[PDB]
Paper text:
Recently, the 4.1 protein, ezrin, radixin and moesin (FERM)-domain–containing kindlin family of proteins has emerged as key players involved in integrin activation. Kindlins cooperate with talin to positively regulate integrin activation. Talin binds the membrane proximal NPxY motif, whereas kindlin binds the membrane distal NxxY motif. Here, we report the crystal structure of human full-length kindlin-3.
Unexpectedly, we observed 3 molecules of kindlin-3 forming a homotrimer in an asymmetric unit of the crystal with each protomer dovetailing the next. Kindlin-3 trimer adopts a triangular prism-like structure along the noncrystallographic 3-fold symmetry axis with the following dimensions: an outer-side length of approximately 110 Å, an inner cavity width of approximately 60 Å, and a height of approximately 90 Å. Each kindlin-3 monomer adopts a cloverleaf-like overall conformation. The F1 domain resides at the center of the kindlin-3 structure with the F1 loop wrapped around its α/β barrel and interacting with other domains. The crystal structure of kindlin-3 trimer also reveals that the additional α2PH helix in the PH domain of protomer A directly wedges into a cleft involving the 2 C-terminal helices (α1F3 and α2F3) and the β-sheet (β5F3-β7F3) in the F3 domain of protomer B, thereby forming extensive contacts. The residues Thr467, Ser468, Val470, Gln471, Ala475, and Ser478 in α2PH of protomer A interact with Ser595, Gln599, Trp600, Ser642, Thr643, Leu656, and Gln659 located in β5F3′ and its preceding loop, and α1F3′ of F3 domain in protomer B (the prime ′ refers to protomer B in the trimer), respectively. In addition, the C-terminus of α1PH and its subsequent loop in the PH domain pack against the 2 C-terminal helices and their connecting loop in the F3 domain of protomer B, through H-bonding (Gln443 in protomer A with main chain of Phe640 in protomer B) and salt bridge (Arg447 in A-Asp653 in B) interactions. In the kindlin-3 trimer, the F3-integrin-binding site in each protomer is occluded by the α2PH helix of the PH domain from the neighboring protomer, suggesting that trimer formation could inhibit kindlin-3 binding to integrin β cytoplasmic tails. Although kindlin-3 monomer binds, albeit weakly with the dissociation constant (Kd) of approximately 200 μM, with integrin β1 cytoplasmic tail, kindlin-3 trimer does not show any detectable binding. Therefore, we proposed that the triple mutations Q471A, A475F, and S478A (henceforth referred to as AFA) could disrupt the protomer–protomer interface in kindlin-3 trimer.
Author numbering: 14 to 145, 173 to 307, 320 to 326, 350 to 484, 499 to 666
Write the structure that this text describes.
């Protein structure tokens, strides 16, 4: 039982210095964690904490490996901190909100978790952008909803469009003005293949969430109010700032839509006040401590509500002695969600427990099944049972209200809806009728369908899709520009502006960027292979756009999720464990 071990230095503390523990070369990474929690004697929740190991540019998710396996010795510095650090996350609607993001996951997983928080479906089309208001929580599950279960006092407007700028600063803001001034934005993309710390992003940094791939999948005006609003608002701010130009009569339909959607963003009523129950309800649980617990989807469970108390099971023969939960509803907090034309009959109950409120979302089928349960839960929350005369006098109130069942249910705005070159060339008077004239076609549109057509008309523009990486090319001086564009990749004479070479993506054979020469090489069927080198923008985000767009457009048929992550990393090169 002889050891003769070495000593390691492990940091802590919002700053960077803590303490030193003693381990062998044979020590387990997970064992070093326990030795480092005892060596400080703090009262925290390290559930998310991990180690950093700067010198070799990566951490240790492998909790079990030997310390000699990573090659670590007493030499190189160690950092014990959290994996989730707060970030500023600038939105594409020119607002911002503070959230915690994963520095430990590779960026494509980090952005996916961010969009997952922000109700942004299909996160493969978005990415984080480098530098040139509510805090966070934890969810960790497939997908949950009431509006987006954000239940707190902070509900910021990222789903509703932002008011239009005053025409004062719409001209004072920086504009594109030419190519090679347009290629700067795409020089700030982060590599969505390495973690967030391999990119040099520290604790308080700012990050931008822009749409990266101009190939949008299943734009549903019902499923994604946040994904739609942010996309539309990225498009307008590429029109109002001349990042993508349109024609004189298209700015009119663009301006007419911005007015119509903004006019409707500026505008049932559950205004109400004050023996067993056995049914098959559909239950949705929420762990108070969800850091190590996922939840399944809406589970259909056999619920029993007796005298006050509620238990639920999965079958009647598995009752009553073997429940899944048992709640002291003698507490409080039942809030409803009823959409008679949508058949949503959901009740939220916040059950105060010593460990933490157990959040459960019950959902019934008919108005009559719903009226019985919510009346029982609203009186159980008041102490009384279903044996009160007011319980039947509360069920009456519900069904009486649930009788209506779906048969009958200007201000002269600015000229700031148009780009700056249309307000210096047009007086603010003769485009106002032309906006209102072209507005009559879209006045019959809903907020999401009118937003959708703004993106549909933005998709029709002749230069929709191009990303402009100005990089040198194969046999040419003058270092012309490239541009990406999902289904193509072109070449432009930088100053002339003409399109010299138009290579198609479908004729592209399998070639990838690699070398010491820092130059990309693509093969292109019929052995016509083009090569170019990075001029001042970058060389890996070009290979990320190419493989990225190739990942897109070849997804699942209708329900395009569950994408192969070992394939996305494959389309940006190199495999990892």
């Amino acid at each position: 039982s002889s050891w003769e071990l070495r000593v390691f230095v492990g940091e802590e503390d919002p700053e960077a210095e803590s303490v030193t523990l003693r381990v062998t070369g044979e020590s387990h990474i997970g064992g070093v964690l326990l030795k480092i929690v005892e060596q400080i004697n703090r009262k925290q929740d390290w559930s998310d904490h991990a180690i950093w190991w700067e010198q070799k540019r990566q951490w240790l998710l492998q909790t079990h490996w030997t310390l000699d396996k990573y090659g670590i010795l007493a030499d190189a510095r160690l950092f014990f901190g959290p994996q989730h650090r707060p970030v500023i996350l600038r939105l594409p609607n020119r607002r911002a909100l503070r959230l915690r993001a994963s520095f430990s996951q590779p960026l494509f997983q980090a952005v996916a978790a961010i969009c997952r928080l922000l109700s942004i479906r299909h996160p493969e089309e978005l990415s984080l952008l480098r530098a040139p208001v509510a805090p966070a929580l934890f969810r960790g599950m497939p997908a949950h909803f009431s509006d987006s279960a954000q239940t707190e006092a902070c509900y910021h407007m990222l789903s509703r469009p932002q008011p239009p700028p005053d025409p004062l600063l719409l001209q004072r803001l920086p504009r594109p003005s030419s190519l090679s001034d347009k290629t700067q934005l795409h020089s700030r993309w982060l590599d969505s293949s390495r973690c967030l710390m391999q990119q040099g992003i520290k604790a308080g940094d700012a990050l931008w969430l822009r749409f990266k791939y101009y190939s949008f999948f299943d734009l549903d005006p019902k499923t994604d109010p946040v994904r739609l609003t942010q996309l539309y608002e990225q498009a307008r701010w590429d029109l109002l700032l001349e990042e993508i130009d349109c024609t004189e009569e298209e700015m009119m339909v663009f301006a007419a839509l911005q007015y119509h959607i903004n006019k409707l963003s500026q505008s049932x009523x559950x205004x109400x006040x004050x023996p067993e129950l056995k049914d098959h309800l559909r239950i949705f649980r929420i762990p108070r401590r969800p850091r190590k617990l996922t939840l399944k989807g809406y589970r259909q469970h056999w619920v029993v509500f007796k005298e006050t108390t509620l238990s639920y099971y999965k079958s009647q023969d598995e009752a009553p002695g073997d429940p899944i939960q048992q709640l002291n509803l003698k507490g409080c907090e039942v809030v409803p969600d009823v959409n008679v034309s949508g058949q949503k009959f959901c009740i939220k109950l916040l059950v105060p427990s010593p460990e933490g409120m157990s959040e459960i979302y019950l959902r019934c089928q008919d108005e009559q099944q719903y009226a019985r349960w919510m009346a029982g839960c609203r009186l159980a929350s008041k102490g009384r049972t279903m044996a009160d005369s007011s319980y039947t006098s509360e069920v009456q109130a519900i069904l009486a209200f649930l009788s209506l069942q779906r048969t009958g249910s200007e201000g002269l705005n600015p000229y700031g809806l148009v780009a700056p070159r249309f307000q210096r060339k047009f007086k603010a008077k003769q485009l106002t009728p032309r906006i209102l004239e072209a507005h009559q076609n879209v006045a019959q549109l809903s907020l999401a369908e009118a937003q959708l057509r703004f993106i549909q008309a933005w998709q029709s523009l002749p230069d929709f899709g191009i990303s402009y990486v100005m990089v040198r090319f194969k046999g040419s001086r003058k270092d012309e520009i490239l541009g990406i564009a999902n289904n193509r990749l072109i070449r432009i004479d930088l100053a002339v502006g003409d399109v010299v070479k138009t290579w198609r993506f479908s004729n592209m054979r399998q070639w990838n960027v690699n070398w010491d020469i820092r130059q990309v090489a693509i093969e292109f069927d019929e052995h016509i292979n083009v090569a170019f080198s990075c001029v001042s923008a970058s060389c890996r985000i070009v290979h990320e756009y190419i493989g990225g767009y190739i990942f897109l457009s070849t997804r699942e048929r209708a329900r395009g999720e569950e994408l192969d992550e070992d394939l996305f990393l494959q389309l940006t090169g190199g495999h990892e464990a």
